Amino acid sequence: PLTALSPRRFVVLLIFSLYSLVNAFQWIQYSIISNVFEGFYGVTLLHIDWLSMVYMLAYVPLIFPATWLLDTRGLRLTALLGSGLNCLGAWIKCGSVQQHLFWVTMLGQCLCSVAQVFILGLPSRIASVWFGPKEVSTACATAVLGNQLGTAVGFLLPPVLVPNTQNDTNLLACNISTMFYGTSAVATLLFILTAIAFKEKPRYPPSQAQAALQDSPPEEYSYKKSIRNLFKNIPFVLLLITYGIMTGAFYSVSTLLNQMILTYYEGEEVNAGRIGLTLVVAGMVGSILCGLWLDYTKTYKQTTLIVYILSFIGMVIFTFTLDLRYIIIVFVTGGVLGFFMTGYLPLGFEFAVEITYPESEGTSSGLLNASAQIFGILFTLAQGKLTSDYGPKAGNIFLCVWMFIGIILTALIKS
Template identity: 30%
Template sequence: MFCRFYNVPGYLVDFTTIIFFLSYILFFYPVSFLIEKHKLKLTILVATGLTLVGNLLKLLASTSDRIWVVLVAQFLIGIGQVQICSLPSKLATTWFGAEEVSTACAIAVLGMQLGSALGCVQSPFIVRSEEVDEVGQQLFNMFLYQAIITGCIFGVVAIFFRSSPSLPPSQSQLNLLAMASSNGTTATFFTHMKNVAKNANFWYIVLSLGLANGVWNSFGVLLNSIYLNYFPNGKTDAGIIALITIISGGCIGSMFFGIILDRTHQFKKVSFGILAMSAFTFIFVGISLLEKSRIGTYITIPIFGFFIAPVLIVGFEYLVEVTYPIPEACSSSTFNAAYYFLSIIATLLFEGLFEAIDYLWTFVVILFILAACAGLILLVNSNLRRRDANLHLNQNVPSPEPEPEMSYYTGTRVTTAKF
């Protein structure tokens, strides 16, 4: 429908999503620096402000000759989302204690996924007409709803959000604050980014959890075209399935595995489990599509999403553990940039394979990639440095001189720590 309304090829409509990935790859480095240099509130205000401006700009794109306005608006929103997507781990460790941090990160990711879920149902339920004039008006209405929602979010952040608690919530956060106060932001930031790039565990996680998330992102981009290939009149079904899948995976699955990580700290086992189950459940996704079972797709795709969507939260938290005491924004933003790059590659690859070798063999390629990701995660070292710092077991975390006494909040009392 969007192709017909704007009179453009399908790849250009897909590019409205891919442009988010490009924004992250282009801007993750300066955004990471700004997150470390400035307070959280300023960072989130800039992010929500750019999102609001982009959505307001879309109000001018409800005529058929303005696809370029949509692309510019998406680019602005994408820059804002670079900051938003880098913040879950940073927010969690800034505000929550050692036994709550993975759950808190999962809740932050859940919020982003809920936004994606709402986006999935907007198009098929708001833009329903086939007439050009009516489509333009319905697009305007959809863009207006988006602008109103993002405007409200901007106002809530401006009025109510605080950058940090009065006391650090954990020993690991206390260590980071002490090191930040004793070192220059600019010099240490570039050192941190170099150390992230040199960390072998980082690359193992990127090429396993990051690649799996790239496959998941590309599946989301291509779901509509995949579904319509088997169910030509299934546009509404595709939107509903996408919504259910985001809720089952991005919301329920992320929360479930976030709690599991907080309770067990078994990052490698959880990572291997969700990757292996993602590969296993994808077999049934392929079968339900090939057999053209509409009911089957309503069951198998959300179950697949339940296991593969949480790779994002698990990847965030696993990276923070193995790269500590490097600040969360450095590892998270670099991870995001890497998997967005992989998302672009996967999307273009799968689109090409669908035409070259058909859908069945492309599904086999996807299954092989997911299985390889499950095997690769086993190479990650299980040294959980942030957990050890919180348990006072890590003797390798550098301490600033002189040794100051600082207080942090444990959840039940204020503790004075010397380090």
Template identity: 30%
Template sequence: MIEEEDSERTALLTDRNYRIVNLRQSDNGTMGTYKTYKRRWIILFVLFLTSLSNAMIWISYSPIADKAANFYNVSAKSINWFALIYMVICIPFGFCAAWLLDTRGLRITLLLAAYLNVLGSGLRVLASFLPKGEFSIAITGQGIAALAQPLAVFAPTKLSALWFSEHQRTRANTVASMANPAGALLGSLIAPVIVYNNDRHLIGYLNIGCLGLAAIPAILGTFTVCSSIPPSPPSASAAEPSQTFFRGLKMLKSNKPFWLLCLCFGSGLGTFTAVSALIEQILCPWGYNSLFAGICGALLIVFGLIGSAIIGQIVDRTRKFEEIVKIGFSFASIAFLAFVVVHHYTDIKVAVGACISLFGLFAVSLYPVCNELAVECTFPVAEGTSSGLLFIAGQVIGVVMLLVSQAMASASPVSTPYQQCEAVSQKYGVEPYDYTYALLFMAIILSLCTLSLVSFFRCTYRRLKAEEELAAENILQSAVHRN
């Protein structure tokens, strides 16, 4: 009898339609269902667009740093603050975002992120149509949009845990998490196309595009995201209450695998962020123009999206989180070292593009897997807390890498015949800088963290183990109840 119940339960757990994925014993002794709802895809779409538009606002000036410096009449290093401010704000506000997500819920967090995007991008539009292109107003708008980033970036693990079955969590997390690099891709591609010269109106058109994209999820979410949780949970772990935010922080203090993962993930995210923000300035002294820099930024993310689609499927089927993360980090480190070697040779676009593509394939695609691995390592700590701390670690290391990179960059002669950096302002020329030593610094940090991860990281999949134990308990309870 128990064997028959076990077989029946296995069939339910592996139901490919995912409509009813488990059974549980309710408090009153009756049998309830774990269900998924179609509306989860709408919420996922709203989160995807919110994160996408936020990332586009973040990266939109990086591929056109020289032209943005000319428009606002500031130095290129001042333009770097449009990217850097995201990381600076995320560090303190990230804790507030994690608390808000875990206490006020997914709906409030998601709508707040969407409207902060609209307000921030609206100020950038206002600044771009003032007579002198007010830098202070534009950077204020960028700061407001930066407040939305942790709200949107911390949400995927929460959404996947509350609305998706255990067989769909990684894929849902992948879709939501990859919205951020997809937005960076969109910004990297569109910005050089729209702002193709120093015409002052073009910056305004770019900012209007960012505002229009940000407005879509704000309007859609207002009318479609009506609750933070579904009427019935989709899995056993979703039915269990998470720890409170502050209790979760206390539980994490002694979780060594989680902090090692934070350090290693942070080095990868920090490297990606620094390279994305500085890509034009890294390549232009060596004869590569802003269009090619934008293409490289796009390749970095396109191959990351491809890798994410593949890895998400593999992880959902195999549950080999730890093994995949270790392999991915190893190949990402090798690819980045190759990019450091080839980037300062002139006229080898294929090699530069290939190296940056491989780095994206292995590094960017690990982002959602690391988020899921963090949740597995820390369960029952709330998903927003563990994934939020992971992202904050990446922002801290990203800030350090950006600042150190700018400090280590050495000036190159403006008269170098093959350089493509434009001196766009009489007051502040965009002087070419050699970032080779800065890239070596990033490569060393990434390699050391990868070695530590491969050698010392071991993780117990606590959430999966809890779900398996609860499933086994439910099988026995069901058998007893029927007898």
């Protein structure tokens, strides 16, 4: 066949990497300053925990219908739906600047959650469709890095944008409205860019594989059968459990970092945001380094076990060092912990893709993400309860025990 590369692909990626960013910024914006919103709305921290967890709750059941819609309708419809849903959720958030309108913020968060189901699975498909064989890996990696950067921006900005001025309600409302207006304007702009430039497919397949895929007639795939076949493979089940445990621990830590820091350090929301940003940035660095190191080594189990062990060590040291009352210690421990845990995720995802090579990669990715969402919900609930009742240390020890169980499971994996 005939294959060629078009410049538009870059734009198609860039816009995505932008509107996948904003969604991430909206996932944690409430959690990082959860105390401020708790004071403003007169609600409990469980409300902010649910604001964080609605992403997982919505993603869990809608992953497979979204995959079917993407496979049948195409990429353009999925991108349009994601961008429009994100923009609409932000606009709904704009109308939630009243102390008695928490439900409006909840509705906006639900809309962003529904957008996430379309947003999350895009990277691999966009990279395959629009980029060549020597750039597909780079395109997917930079898309995931854009999502991670959005998470980091959500960690960093809100603490500074909205100071905890509980004394005056007008100033807090003004700051919240300003943040919501900025986010909604950015989301609407990115939706306009997606509607204008996000083409369904390039004129020529970027690579021979994409040309063959286009030439080959579409064939229906039974997602239920694929899931049933995948569940048979015990090693895949173990890898799924371990990846879910790791991702859920990361999500719970991200959600409850504000509470953990506020328990010991008072009036340090900006420092908490900086700690989260350092954690996520070190996570990206570790992800890149681990990906390249895995590509060079060709070993999929020893690296996974070592990374899991180091992540558990980081979690334990963070737990036993957070109470020392030194912010530098918290910065360092969070940085190393995030490095290890966030670098684990790409390794586990690639291992799952490789081990299940006969099976469809999309179904495996969807199952991995669903397990991560469920584990994150459970871990966030348990750790929040423990922190509220017994303090951060109890929930941190619970997470450490879960990480040790994950190490055991990873050791039991065979391949």
